Structures are given as C-alpha cells and as structure tokens.
Amino acid sequence: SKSTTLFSRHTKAIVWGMQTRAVQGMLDFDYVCSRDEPSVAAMVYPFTGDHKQKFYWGHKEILIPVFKNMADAMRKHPEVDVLINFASLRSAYDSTMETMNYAQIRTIAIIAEGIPEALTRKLIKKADQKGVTIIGPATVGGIKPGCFKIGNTGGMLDNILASKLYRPGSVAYVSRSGGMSNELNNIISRTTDGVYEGVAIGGDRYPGSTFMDHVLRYQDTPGVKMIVVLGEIGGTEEYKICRGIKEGRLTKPIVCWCIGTCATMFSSEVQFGHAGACANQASETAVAKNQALKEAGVFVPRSFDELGEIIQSVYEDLVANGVI
Amino acid sequence: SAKAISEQTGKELLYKFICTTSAIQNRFKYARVTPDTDWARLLQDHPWLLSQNLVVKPDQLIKRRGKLGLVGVNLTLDGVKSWLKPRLGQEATVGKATGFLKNFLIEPFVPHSQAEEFYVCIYATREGDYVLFHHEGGVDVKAQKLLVGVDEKLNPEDIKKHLLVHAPEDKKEILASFISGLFNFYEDLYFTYLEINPLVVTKDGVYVLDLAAKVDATADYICKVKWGDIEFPPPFGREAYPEEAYIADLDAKSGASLKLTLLNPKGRIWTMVAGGGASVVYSDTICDLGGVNELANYGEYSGAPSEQQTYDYAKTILSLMTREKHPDGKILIIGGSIANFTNVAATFKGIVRAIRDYQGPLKEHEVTIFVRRGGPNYQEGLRVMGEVGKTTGIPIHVFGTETHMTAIVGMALGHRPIPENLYFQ
Numbered sequence: 001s002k003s004t005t006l007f008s009r010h011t012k013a014i015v016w017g018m019q020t021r022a023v024q025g026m027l028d029f030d031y032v033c034s035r036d037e038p039s040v041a042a043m044v045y046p047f048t049g050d051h052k053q054k055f056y057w058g059h060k061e062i063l064i065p066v067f068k069n070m071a072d073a074m075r076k077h078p079e080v081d082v083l084i085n086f087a088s089l090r091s092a093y094d095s096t097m098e099t100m101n102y103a104q105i106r107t108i109a110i111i112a113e114g115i116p117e118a119l120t121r122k123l124i125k126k127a128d129q130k131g132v133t134i135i136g137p138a139t140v141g142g143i144k145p146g147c148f149k150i151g152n153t154g155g156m157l158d159n160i161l162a163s164k165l166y167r168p169g170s171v172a173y174v175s176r177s178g179g180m181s182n183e184l185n186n187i188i189s190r191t192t193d194g195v196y197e198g199v200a201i202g203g204d205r206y207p208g209s210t211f212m213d214h215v216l217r218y219q220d221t222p223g224v225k226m227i228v229v230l231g232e233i234g235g236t237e238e239y240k241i242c243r244g245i246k247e248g249r250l251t252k253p254i255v256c257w258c259i260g261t262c263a264t265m266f267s268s269e270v271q272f273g274h275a276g277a278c279a280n281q282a283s284e285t286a287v288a289k290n291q292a293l294k295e296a297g298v299f300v301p302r303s304f305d306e307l308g309e310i311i312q313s314v315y316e317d318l319v320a321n322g323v324i
Numbered sequence: 325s326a327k328a329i330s331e332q333t334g335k336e337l338l339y340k341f342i343c344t345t346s347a348i349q350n351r352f353k354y355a356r357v358t359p360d361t362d363w364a365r366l367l368q369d370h371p372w373l374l375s376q377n378l379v380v381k382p383d384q385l386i387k388r389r390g391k392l393g394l395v396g397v398n399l400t401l402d403g404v405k406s407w408l409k410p411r412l413g414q415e416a417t418v419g420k421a422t423g424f425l426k427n428f429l430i431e432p433f434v435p436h437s438q439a440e441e442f443y444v445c446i447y448a449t450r451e452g453d454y455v456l457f458h459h460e461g462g463v464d465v466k467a468q469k470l471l472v473g474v475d476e477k478l479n480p481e482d483i484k485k486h487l488l489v490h491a492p493e494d495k496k497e498i499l500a501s502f503i504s505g506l507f508n509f510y511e512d513l514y515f516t517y518l519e520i521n522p523l524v525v526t527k528d529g530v531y532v533l534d535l536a537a538k539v540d541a542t543a544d545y546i547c548k549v550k551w552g553d554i555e556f557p558p559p560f561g562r563e564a565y566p567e568e569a570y571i572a573d574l575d576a577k578s579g580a581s582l583k584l585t586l587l588n589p590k591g592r593i594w595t596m597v598a599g600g601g602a603s604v605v606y607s608d609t610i611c612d613l614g615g616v617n618e619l620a621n622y623g624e625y626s627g628a629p630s631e632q633q634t635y636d637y638a639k640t641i642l643s644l645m646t647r648e649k650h651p652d653g654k655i656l657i658i659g660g661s662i663a664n665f666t667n668v669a670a671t672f673k674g675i676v677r678a679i680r681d682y683q684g685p686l687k688e689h690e691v692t693i694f695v696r697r698g699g700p701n702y703q704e705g706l707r708v709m710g711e712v713g714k715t716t717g718i719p720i721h722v723f724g725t726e727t728h729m730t731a732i733v734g735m736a737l738g739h740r741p742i743p744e745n746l747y748f749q
C-alpha cells in the first residue's frame with residue numbers, strides 16, 4: 001500500500017515512553033547484529049525535563065538523550081524516521097497524532113492495547129493521507145534480523161542467539177499475535193535459513209497496517225523468497241491474499257494458517273484476547289478463511305501442529321530450484 | 325473489543341441521550357421481569373401495565389424471537405402471565421445454544437400497519453460507518469445504504485435523497501430527523517453496531533420497538549459518565565460467573581492482560597496459556613483432537629503480569645477445577661509461546677505458589693499438569709514447576725523451547741507419548 005522498505009541497519013528511532021528495559025534489549029540486538037550505532041537516537045518523556053540516560057552498548061556505558069517535548073527530539077535528531085510509541089492507551093491517540101506532524105516519521109509503532117476503534121480509525125486516515133506506516137496498535141512490533149527490532153520484540157540476547165536473529169534468512173512473516181511472532185522466529189529458524197523480516201500487526205479490529213500491506217512489501221523485496229502468514233479469525237483481511245494471487249500480484253510461495261478453528265465448534269460466541277477476534281459473518285471464521293486460501297494456491301497446513309512442517313517443505317522446494 | 329448490550333440498556337441510553345425533533349413515544353415505558361419478579365411490586369412500580377395491552381419477549385441477545393414464538397403480542401397482563409407460564413424459567417435451545425429463559429421485557433403494544441414498520445441500522449467498518457434504511461421493516465427483512473466517512477458528517481439531504489427514496493412521503497422528515505439523531509448518539513456513546521428493527525412511525529410519532537447494539541467497551545474511560553454502571557451480557561447459552569468478573573476486574577487494574585471465560589465448568593481439560601494468540605492455538609489444538617466437550621475454559625494472561633497478579637489469576641483456575649471429582653481425573657495445560665518480555669520466572673513462581681496452596685484438592689481431583697514455555701528466564705521458571713510437582717506429589721511434566729508448542733496437548737490426551745528426554749529443555 002505505502003512504502004516497501006521500513007527498516008534497515010541504519011534506521012534510527014525515537015522512543016516515546018520511559019521503557020528503559022525495551023531500549024536496552026534493542027541495543028543488545030543492535031550490537032550482536034554488528035550495527036555501527038544504536039537504533040534509539042532519543043527518548044521522549046513529557047513528565048520530566050530534558051536529560052540523558054545511562055545505557056550499555058556492549059560492555060561500554062553510553063548515553064541517549066531524553067526530551068520532554070517531542071519538538072526538541074525531532075529537531076535535534078533529524079536522522080529519525082521511526083517512532084516506537086509506548087504511551088498508555090489514554091494518551092496514545094494524542095501522541096501518535098502529534099508524531100504525524102513531523103514529516104520525517106515514515107513508520108510508527110503503537111504498542112498500547114485498548115485504544116477505542118473509532119480513534120484508531122482516525123489514526124489510520126491521517127497516516128493513509130501522509131504515507132506513514134503504522135504497526136499496531138496492541139502489538140509488540142516486529143523484528144528485521146540484522147537491522148532493527150521494535151522494542152521488546154525478539155526478547156533478550158539469548159533468544160536472539162538461539163533463533164539466529166542476528167542475520168537474515170529468506171523467510172518473511174506477518175502475524176497478528178506478538179507472542180506467536182517470537183514462536184514464528186523459533187519455528188522459521190529451525191526449518192529455514194531464518195527470518196528476513198517479521199511484523200506483528202496487533203490484535204485490534206482495524207490494524208494500522210493490514211496483512212496484505214506487509215505481504216505486498218514482501219512480494220517487492222528480493223531477499224524475501226517465501227512468505228508466512230499467521231492469520232486469525234475475524235474480519236476479511238486474508239481474502240486480499242487470495243485476490244492478490246488471483247491477479248498475478250502475489251507470485252512468491254505463501255504459507256498461511258489462520259488460528260481460531262475451535263470457534264466453529266463452540267455452541268455460542270467466545271471473545272478471544274485479540275479485540276478483533278470476533279467473526280461477524282460466516283466468511284470471517286478461521287475454517288472458512290483457511291479453506292479459501294488453500295483453493296487460491298496458498299500453502300495451508302491441516303493445523304498449527306503441522307505449520308513448521310509445511311514451511312520446511314516450501315523452503316526445500318525453493319532451495320531445489322536455486323531460488324534461495 | 326466491541327460488546328453487545330441488552331435491548332433494555334440500549335433503549336435506556338437512546339431514550340436518555342438521543343436528540344431529535346421527533347417526539348419519541350413510550351420512553352422508559354418497559355418492565356423487566358425474571359422468575360423472581362414480585363408481580364405485585366412490579367405493578368406498584370409500573371402501574372401502566374394495566375392501562376393498555378402489552379408485548380412480552382426475552383431480552384437475552386436472542387435474535388428473531390418472533391420466528392421462535394418468543395414474542396407475545398397485544399396481551400393483557402393476565403395474558404402476559406399465561407404466555408410467560410410455559411416459557412419463563414424454562415430451558416430452551418435456540419439454534420445450537422441451550423440456555424434458560426429468565427429475562428423478559430414487557431412494553432406497551434403499539435398498533436400500526438406493516439407499512440409503518442421501518443428498518444434502520446448503523447455499523448462500523450475500517451473506512452467508516454454504514455447507515456442503512458429499508459421501508460419494508462419487520463421480521464421478514466436490497467436495503468438502501470451509504471458510507472459515512474471517518475470524519476464525515478451525515479448530511480440530512482443524503483438521508484432524504486438516497487436512504488428514504490422508498491419511504492412514504494409524509495414520514496420522510498420525521499424519519500430523516502430521527503436517523504440523524506440516531507447517528508450522533510451512535511458516535512457520542514461509541515456504538516459499533518446499532519439495529520432498530522422495526523422502527524415504527526405512526527401519526528403519533530416514532531416508536532423504538534426493537535433494538536440490538538454493540539458498543540466499544542474500550543471507550544469506558546471516555547464514556548463512563550453516560551454509560552453508567554453499564555452491563556455486557558454473555559451470549560445466550562452461557563452464564564456469567566463471579567470468577568470471570570474477578571479476572572476481568574484485575575485486567576482493568578494494569579496494562580497486563582487477564583482474560584478468562586468459562587465454557588464447561590465440569591470439563592476435565594483446563595488451560596492456563598500465556599498470550600492472546602497462543603491461548604487460541606492451544607484451544608484449536610485441543611478441539612482438533614476431539615476434546616471440545618471437555619475443554620473447561622478459554623483464557624490468557626500476558627503483558628508481563630506481576631508475580632502476585634499471576635498467583636491471583638492461577639488460584640482462580642485451580643479453584644474452578646477442584647469443585648467436583650471427575651471419573652478420569654483432570655488435566656491442566658500451562659502453555660505458551662517463547663515470550664518476548666514476560667518474565668517467565670516471576671509468572672511461574674506465582675503459578676507455583678498457587679499449586680502449593682491448592683495441592684491437596686488438585687490431588688483429590690487427580691489433576692495432571694503439563695508445561696511448555698519459553699521467554700525471559702524460562703529455565704528458572706521450568707525448574708520450580710518440576711520442583712513443586714515433586715514437593716507435592718502432583719504429576720507435572722515440564723518442557724521448554726525444545727518441544728513444539730502444542731505437543732503437550734497430544735501428550736495430555738494420549739495421542740502421543742510423554743518424552744522424558746525433553747524435560748527442562
């Protein structure tokens with residue numbers, strides 16, 4: 001829909017919020033990725049006055065500036081095009097709208113869960129007209145191995161090492177679930193050359209950027225040879241992928257599993273954790289969407305039980321033809 | 325999430341807050357009735373029940389109550405009582421949901437023709453809110469429709485020009501004004517769905533005979549002044565439990581995320597999975613392996629809850645599964661993905677503190693526990709699980725990242741064996 005490349009090993013970001021632990025986790029990731037510099041240029045915190053914070057670049061202690069006014073951070077760090085918003089739900093709308101007044105920001109991550117859908121609809125409309133990519137709300141974010149990870153995504157160094165998240169493979173994924181995104185990190189690393197980029201779009205009814213938004217970016221990314229989608233019950237988003245393939249827009253292999261098949265076996269409605277998990281028509285069920293995907297040429301497993309098994313199968317057939 | 329409200333709650337809010345040129349009739353003129361209803365006290369509070377004939381129907385999020393014979397129309401109070409006699413308090417299956425009929429509305433009967441029954445609906449999408457109208461309202465509803473953009477305003481001339489093309493000419497200005505007032509009320513109180521079928525217009529004004537609605541529960545902090553102590557009923561086929569209200573109350577107190585819904589309180593399969601998505605996958609897996617009729621709950625804890633928060637969540641689940649022995653015992657799935665930031669050590673310490681205080685009952689009900697979890701400090705978390713399983717006698721099997729996330733479900737159901745070569749890994 002909008003840009004194709006959001007992050008690189010030179011991406012510099014501003015962090016709205018006093019989330020020291022998440023910033024340090026990002027820095028640890030930057031280090032073992034052999035980045036030249038930290039990915040967090042400055043933090044914003046309107047509660048306290050301008051100051052600087054102790055952080056650790058490897059074993060060496062460094063400092064990152066913390067500004068009270070967003071206007072001062074954007075001005076003193078014009079290299080920033082990404083903002084990771086850790087604001088509480090009550091203030092996430094205002095701070096996000098304020099961010100999109102700085103045309104330097106091309107990608108915003110909204111962590112907070114609980115933002116009224118009517119408000120997020122208003123955020124989407126502003127970003128749509130300004131070409132800003134919103135990842136969220138209600139997401140941990142995403143990770144681009146070797147280059148950039150959003151806040152807590154990917155966890156601590158030991159997980160970044162175990163899942164080989166310090167260098168890219170050829171497999172891009174997009175999920176609604178933040179926790180399952182780190183499971184996809186684990187599964188993909190164990191069955192392929194590893195993750196090239198992963199995005200968690202969040203569990204809300206209207207995510208800032210949809211599944212197809214990122215699947216499209218992946219179709220336009222040469223280093224990406226195959227795509228995994230952990231879809232979900234609710235809405236009709238995954239149907240855009242059936243369309244994309246039908247129109248010749250989606251050519252690379254696509255693996256997809258939609259979670260929420262149990263809801264077809266419940267005698268009445270059950271709302272799941274993700275605010276957008278509700279199936280309002282028959283076509284929004286996980287079973288109905290999995291079936292439509294398989295008929296459109298998507299590689300759909302029988303169950304999540306066998307998701308890693310089908311990912312490995314697609315990968316090896318791609319290695320066979322010398323695509324990887 | 326968007327949550328359904330009762331017809332009464334929706335009608336109360338509409339009557340109180342809608343602003344319209346149209347005089348809306350029979351405002352607040354309804355009587356709520358349950359199996360406990362003191363019918364003498366009801367007539368004290370609502371003397372109008374004897375002034376005209378009535379309509380009675382269940383208000384429990386049951387759709388097409390007419391087709392199901394669940395609307396008694398144009399009845400005296402005595403007729404309402406006789407009509408309620410074989411229905412109130414009785415068990416009833418609607419579609420595939422089975423529940424008790426126990427909450428009914430009694431409203432005045434409004435005479436009118438079929439030509440005076442209209443359809444109105446407003447629901448939300450990503451690109452905005454769609455406003456629908458059909459001149460052929462009623463139980464047998466092709467409808468006119470138009471998108472109101474995100475920051476767009478509903479201009480009454482589009483209501484008049486497009487939506488009301490097929491509406492009778494005389495009733496067009498009152499209909500235009502009501503739909504305009506309805507939309508503003510829809511926005512102000514953060515509705516995401518609002519259906520009035522039928523909306524009745526006679527020479528005496530506008531009547532809201534039926535109402536179905538959902539509101540954005542996340543917008544309480546914005547709307548609580550007008551919402552009041554607002555209630556979100558469970559779908560027909562389920563009861564509300566205090567444990568659910570307890571957990572929902574904790575979730576409201578921190579950024580942490582604590583959901584819990586009881587499906588089958590006598591089911592021998594309980595889950596305490598972390599994550600909004602993982603909890604769904606484990607549920608998908610259990611049902612995919614034939615366990616849909618024994619799964620007791622759906623729930624998740626995530627967002628880095630504290631150790632105490634996790635103990636309070638866990639102690640709720642353990643109480644619920646120690647209320648009646650099962651012939652074949654019971655099973656507890658403590659699972660999840662490799663977490664990004666949730667301290668697996670602090671959370672499992674809280675769970676382990678719950679398994680200690682409830683160890684006696686858990687052995688009476690023959691509970692077996694299965695564990696798979698990764699994330700920050702997961703190794704220390706795995707240890708105390710295996711260690712409490714030994715300092716109690718409760719059988720626990722503890723797995724880590726070297727186990728597929730849902731593999732422990734097949735283990736728990738006997739579709740695959742327990743591999744002791746993966747413990748604590």
Ligand SMILES: Nc1ncnc2c1ncn2[C@@H]1O[C@H](COP(=O)(O)OP(=O)(O)O)[C@@H](O)[C@H]1O
Nearest residue numbers: 379387388389390432433434462463521533534
């Ligand atoms: N208060 C009322 N006065 C007169 N007729 C009514 C009244 N309430 C309902 N009806 C009639 O009964 C029908 C069914 O009632 P309704 O409340 O719409 O429930 P449902 O849509 O679930 O069948 C209505 O379409 C209308 O024709």
Ligand SMILES: [Mg+2]
Nearest residue numbers: 463521522534
């Ligand atoms: Mg109706």
Ligand SMILES: [Mg+2]
Nearest residue numbers: 273581600626
């Ligand atoms: Mg969640």
